[PDB]
Design a binder for this molecule. Structure first.
Ligand SMILES: CCCCCCCCCCCCCC(=O)SCCNC(=O)CCNC(=O)[C@H](O)C(C)(C)COP(=O)(O)OP(=O)(O)OC[C@H]1O[C@@H](n2cnc3c(N)ncnc32)[C@H](O)[C@@H]1OP(=O)(O)O
Ligand SMILES: N[C@@H](CC(=O)N1C[C@H](CO)[C@@H](c2ccc(Cl)cc2)C1)Cc1ccc(Cl)cc1
Ligand SMILES: [Mg+2]
Length: 411
């Protein structure tokens, strides 16, 4: 049933998954020297391209391909519209590897036809806690601990084939070539998410959305006036009132993050992310890159009291194209990013996120049920969205975990 995924070092079924007991590689160990030097053979109308992410024109070409051809909802009403500043940020973290960004262009006119991006990530991905307990009961603790050290692997994102080229087996070709370039750098595992079911996820979670400007959301048909609001004489006035927020953060001590906060934010974040089975390890340079505010892209606030940072939150912006509408071009969405709470309940920290996002003119706040995102769904009036986000590894055997054991945000 899967002519491509069946030939790959991934678990092939849930049954196979269900009997994985320790973290570790799927495949034959191999070396750099075994991997072909030359790009995979490709059709003569196409050519491989490595974009230069320091070139505005290169960023622009990837921007247009995604604007027109990246992920839509199931009803083809909204399509993500990552900005060029956002792509620069997401594709170029500290020590990114230019060769990991793989594109296919049409020779004759250099039109971008397909893209896939790999970036480095330092990931904890050793045997999960629940399996380590089982291991102890079996007498098997050393085997369970073998791959505990964080690993420098590849995070794959932004896979996109132009609509005119769909269903011609281009996506496997891109994935093979990314894999080759990554292996040529002595990296053998990757982590990726998708909103579709593939062989075979190690975790799955729901999406959640929090209305910030319900009037606009109803106008563009992101949201309905739900059926129980009909019994009311005036449905929408009641909807704004339900979703209203304070004008200003309720935590005094709340202020935008600045560069001098990098060490403290690193510490509180890493201490928190430790509680999860799969989770990134960030250097100070990586905290600076992913969390310092950047206009239009990422927004980060710390709670500082008595000169020390005790809590923080971050969210990032992605507008979506509204594919049908008359009145509105764009849905301005805020996505919960990393955070850490040590002084106040997480719900009270995130409420200030919703307040800031609303003040700065976002329409909806969005998140997946990773991290401790559940602990605040009901008080903060999030509702579940459609479908599920699935988390995957390439060349890594891994026991199924709850999404509440996952701490990697994928942009
Ligand atoms: C060590 C380093 C390893 C590095 C690599 C690690 C693996 C990275 C894996 C990539 C992680 C990406 C993470 C993200 O970015 S997920 C975001 C994916 N992008 C979108 O959904 C944007 C809109 N859609 C498209 O652009 C195209 O429909 C895509 C490109 C998705 C497929 O193109 P098309 O529709 O023209 O199809 P095809 O004929 O060329 O190919 C059909 C084959 O492709 C398999 N397929 C379909 N969708 C996905 C998908 N989302 N992940 C992996 N495989 C996918 C499918 O099951 C089939 O194989 P098999 O079922 O026949 O076997
Ligand atoms: N490789 C994936 C990256 C991803 O997992 N995302 C990227 C989306 C934007 O940052 C994020 C997301 C978060 C909250 C909600 Cl409600 C929807 C999508 C989840 C591709 C993908 C992109 C969009 C969607 Cl909906 C699902 C999957
Ligand atoms: Mg294709």
């Amino acid at each position: 049933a899967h002519a491509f995924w069946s030939t790959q070092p991934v678990p092939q079924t849930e049954d196979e998954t269900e009997k994985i007991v320790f973290a570790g590689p799927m495949d034959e160990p191999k070396t750099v020297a075994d991997i072909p030097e030359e790009p995979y053979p490709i059709a003569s109308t196409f050519e491989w391209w490595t974009p230069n992410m320091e070139a505005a024109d290169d960023i622009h070409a990837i921007y247009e391909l995604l604007r027109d051809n990246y992920v839509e909802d199931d009803d083809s009403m909204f399509r993500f519209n990552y900005s060029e500043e956002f792509l620069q940020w997401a594709l170029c973290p500290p020590n990114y590897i230019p060769d990991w960004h793989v594109a296919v262009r049409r020779k004759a006119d250099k039109k971008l036809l397909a893209f896939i991006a790999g970036v480095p990530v330092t990931l904890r991905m050793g045997t999960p806690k629940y399996m380590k307990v089982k291991a102890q009961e079996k007498g098997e603790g050393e085997e369970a601990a073998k791959y505990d050290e964080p690993r420098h692997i590849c995070e794959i994102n932004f896979l996109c084939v132009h609509k005119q080229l769909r269903e011609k087996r281009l996506a496997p070709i891109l994935i093979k070539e990314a894999t080759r370039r990554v292996n040529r750098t002595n990296v053998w595992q990757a982590v990726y998410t998708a909103g579709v079911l593939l062989p075979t996820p190690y975790a799955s979670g729901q999406y959640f959305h929090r209305s910030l400007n319900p009037e606009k959301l109803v106008e563009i048909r992101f949201s309905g006036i739900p059926a129980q609001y009909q019994k009311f004489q005036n449905p929408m006035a009641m909807l704004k009132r339900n979703y209203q927020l304070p004008s200003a953060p309720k935590n005094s001590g709340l202020r935008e993050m600045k560069p001098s906060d990098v060490p403290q934010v690193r510490r509180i974040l890493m201490n928190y992310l430790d509680s999860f089975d799969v989770g990134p390890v960030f250097s100070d340079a990586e905290i600076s890159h992913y969390l310092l505010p950047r206009d239009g892209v990422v927004f980060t606030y710390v709670v500082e009291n008595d000169k020390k940072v005790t809590d923080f939150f971050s969210f990032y912006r992605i507008p979506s194209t509204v594919i049908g509408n008359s009145n509105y071009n764009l849905l301005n969405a805020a996505y919960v990013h990393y955070y850490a709470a040590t002084s106040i309940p997480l719900h009270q920290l995130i409420l200030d996120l919703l307040i800031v996002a609303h003040s700065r003119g976002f329409d909806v706040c969005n998140m997946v049920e990773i991290l401790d995102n559940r602990s605040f769904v009901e008080q903060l009036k999030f509702g579940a969205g459609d479908g599920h986000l699935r988390y995957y590894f390439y060349n890594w055997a891994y026991p199924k975990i709850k999404p509440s054991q996952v701490a990697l945000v994928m942009l």
